[PDB]
Each structure stands twice: as structure tokens, then as C-alpha cells.
Design a protein around this ligand. Structure first.
Ligand code: SF4
Length: 351
């Protein structure tokens, strides 16, 4: 807004290049980056080992502006759901704590174009791609809130997943540098095994991803055959299951963050994809792809075309897969979470 460079938009190299233009040596960029990501600092004044002159330069041409929280919802089990303001739009960020880990689910887009029939985001349609600052800024903001204070169980973020609003492979230009910052020693310093990109299967973009970065891959499959997938996840019409699975294999040739084993996501949809015959078909489909299968007890929202699969159907589905020796997990569901308002506020201030 002020015509200043948001430093959260910049990877290590771009940061160094920017600092070079300020007439500063590359080490000063690394130093500021460290303050930004190791101490979640967005205030140049708090950077005590930087001299006043450099501080003055930075305040004039740059800022550290992460997206703000407009709604926080805290659950019993420790799960936090944030609504995040991105310009004039809203995205979602979710913190999920566990005993041995803490996972952040980060949005890649404002809305989505993929039209997955089980997805409430798909209802909105695609608005825009998120900028680097608005992706990495979700991690930054969450880490600040989780760190600031200070509750039992909620350890610092250990894992980040590109899983939320939007298809990450349709925003490669912003998703890739964001992940680079997550991975970087001077950024969040996360292992590549703990940075996971989840995709529904944009094949040429996946081929592209593997040439750009080494990060863990997860796939949103959600169906055992092409006729069912064409219906539930329309992008399958462009790139079918076999085209998707071959692209996964090509990615694993360039990348070893997965250690050969991709996580496969599968929402359970009442009488759509949750039958024993579907499970047997899934096992056959996945016989040549090393995997862990996450069966997801999906909950309907108002207007959803599908119902929840019963627990006994999910159980029988799980057992079929286990009989073939697949590592399969029924994912423990986490959390239980006006138009005239602006004019009303104006009419109130009048009194
Ligand atoms: S890719 Fe993800 S966000 Fe996009 S419509 Fe499908 S499930 Fe929804």
C-alpha cells in the first residue's frame, strides 16, 4: 500500500539481491531473514544487532506484512482454525497439534477452480492466486500466535502441508518460493520430509514441480476408477488416474522427500466410493505405487451432493486394503467448527 517491498515475498536470493540494491552486503539480508523467521519479528526496531542507519533504510523501502487473523476458532483437542484476511478476500489456515508433531495446513489460493463435488471451497469458485507473502505469511502468523502464548500440548509447528483452499499446482510461481523459505536454514529450516504438497493431479505442473524443488508429495485421489473420479474430481477428465500415477512416478525419480512412499487421500462418500468392491479395485490400482492410504470420514455441508459414509462401511473398506498389506489409516477427524452490517455500523456512529 505504501509502495514498500514486503520482505515476506522474497526467498533468500531475492532478499540478498534487494539488500544489494540498498548498498548492503548479503550477510545483512541473512541477518534480517533470521529475525523474521526464527523470531517471528515484523518490526525493524526490534532487530537490535542491526545498526540504526540500515534500520532507517528498511523502514522506508520495505515492511514485513503477514496476513491478519479475522477469526480464530479453538477446539477441545487443540486444533486451531483461522480465517485469514488476504487483501479483501479470506483464506483458511489450520493448526493441528499431536504428541510427537504439530501440523499446519496452508491455503494456496483464494477459492479454487477444480470443482471437486465434495468440497465446500469449490462452491466459491476461483478468485485469485495467493502471493508468496500470503502463503509463507500463514506459517509466520500461525507460528507467532502459537508461540506468543503458550498452551499445554501446542508445540511449535513441525510440519507444513499445502492442503487447504486451492490447488497448489495451479499456483507454482508463488507456492514454490514459499516452500523454499520453509526449507531454508534462514527461513523456517524445515526438513523436505516435513513440507508436503498435496495435489489433485495437474500433471504438467507436477512434472514442472519436480524440476524446481524437492518436497514431499501427497495426492488427492478419492476414487478407485476413472468413471467415478471423472464425476467426483473433474480434473480427472483432463488427466486420468494412470496419467496421474505415472506423473507421481516421474516426480519420485527426481525427488526423495517421500522416501518412495506417497500419502494417498481418500474421502469416504456414502454409496459413491466406499463399497468393498471399490476397495478391491483401489488395491489393484495401487499395486505398483508405494503408499500410505488415508481414509477420510467426510462430513456433509449445506448443499453437498453426498452423505457421510457409515463407520461400518469405512471399517470394511479399511480391512479390505489391509488384507493386501497396505498401510491404511482412518484419519481422526479434528475440530468441531451479514450483508447490511456495514451500513448498520454507519447508522450507529450517527448516534
Ligand atoms: S482441489 Fe482441493 S480446494 Fe480445489 S475444489 Fe478440489 S478439494 Fe476443493
Amino acid at each position: 500500500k505504501d509502495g514498500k517491498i514486503n520482505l515476506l515475498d522474497l526467498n533468500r536470493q531475492q532478499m540478498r539481491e534487494f539488500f544489494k540494491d540498498l548498498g548492503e552486503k548479503p550477510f545483512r539480508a541473512d541477518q534480517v531473514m533470521k529475525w523474521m523467521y526464527h523470531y517471528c519479528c515484523d518490526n525493524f526496531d526490534e532487530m537490535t544487532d542491526i545498526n540504526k542507519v540500515l534500520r532507517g533504510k528498511l523502514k522506508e523501502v520495505a515492511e514485513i506484512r503477514a496476513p491478519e487473523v479475522v477469526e480464530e476458532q479453538r477446539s477441545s483437542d487443540g486444533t486451531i482454525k483461522w480465517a485469514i484476511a488476504v487483501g479483501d478476500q479470506r483464506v483458511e489456515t489450520v493448526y493441528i497439534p499431536e504428541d510427537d508433531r504439530a501440523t499446519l495446513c496452508v491455503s494456496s489460493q483464494v477459492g479454487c477452480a477444480l470443482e471437486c463435488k465434495f468440497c465446500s471451497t469449490a462452491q466459491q469458485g476461483f478468485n485469485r492466486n495467493l502471493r508468496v507473502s500470503e502463503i509463507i505469511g500463514q506459517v509466520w502468523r500461525a507460528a507467532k500466535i502459537v508461540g506468543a502464548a503458550k498452551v499445554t500440548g501446542q508445540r511449535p509447528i513441525t510440519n507444513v502441508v499445502m492442503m487447504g483452499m486451492g490447488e497448489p499446482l495451479l499456483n507454482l510461481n508463488n507456492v514454490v518460493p514459499a516452500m523454499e523459505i520453509m526449507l531454508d536454514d534462514f527461513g523456517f529450516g524445515l526438513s523436505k520430509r516435513r513440507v508436503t504438497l498435496s495435489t489433485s493431479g495437474v500433471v504438467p505442473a507436477l512434472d514442472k514441480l519436480g524440476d524446481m524443488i524437492d518436497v514431499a508429495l501427497a495426492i488427492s485421489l478419492h476414487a478407485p476408477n476413472d468413471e467415478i473420479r471423472d464425476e467426483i474430481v473433474p480434473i480427472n477428465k483432463k488427466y486420468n488416474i494412470e496419467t496421474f500415477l505415472a506423473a507421481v512416478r516421474r516426480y519420485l525419480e527426481k525427488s526423495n522427500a517421500n522416501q518412495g512412499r506417497v500419502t494417498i487421500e481418500y474421502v469416504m462418500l456414502d454409496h459413491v466410493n466406499d463399497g468393498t468392491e471399490h476397495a478391491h479395485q483401489l488395491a489393484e490400482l495401487l499395486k505398483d505405487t508405494p503408499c500410505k492410504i488415508n481414509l477420510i470420514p467426510w462430513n456433509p455441508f449445506p448443499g453437498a451432493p453426498y452423505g457421510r459414509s457409515s463407520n461400518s462401511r469405512i471399517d470394511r473398506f479399511s480391512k479390505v486394503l489391509m488384507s493386501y498389506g497396505f498401510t491404511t489409516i482412518v484419519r481422526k477427524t479434528r475440530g468441531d467448527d451479514d450483508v447490511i452490517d456495514r451500513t448498520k455500523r454507519t447508522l450507529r456512529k450517527r448516534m
